[PDB]
Design a protein around this nucleic acid. Sequence first.
RNA 1: GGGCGGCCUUCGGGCUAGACGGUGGGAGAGGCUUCGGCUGGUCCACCCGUGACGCUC
Length: 84
Amino acid sequence: CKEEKQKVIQEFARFPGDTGSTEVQVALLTLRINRLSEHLKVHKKDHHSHRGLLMMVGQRRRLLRYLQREDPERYRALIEKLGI
RNA sequence: GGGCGGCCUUCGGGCUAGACGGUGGGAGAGGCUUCGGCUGGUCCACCCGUGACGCUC
């Protein structure tokens, strides 16, 4: 994933070398929340791994909450640069 | 929605010591498995990134 993860970081960074901004963080949660749902499909018995998903979904909503009520400009772009 | 909540400010702002992320690691009993594998937590380093984004009902 130092390939895939890093791809999205290059994609959602705010500057050459950014890896922690609210954007990159959301981009990663996003990417992570998708690769797990796709998983849960195959292994729908896994109720345990489901938990994790519940969290990342919340963790992401909270970061977004922060951004929305912090810099909408940056917000609106990030949400229409993915979905919601 | 409720309660609580970092540092400095001449209140306009400024921070990184929390939190999250990135990078590199630790764990003899996490879950599902079409057993050929997917997937959730968890602890530690840095002192790279954001910058209080936290905590609690």
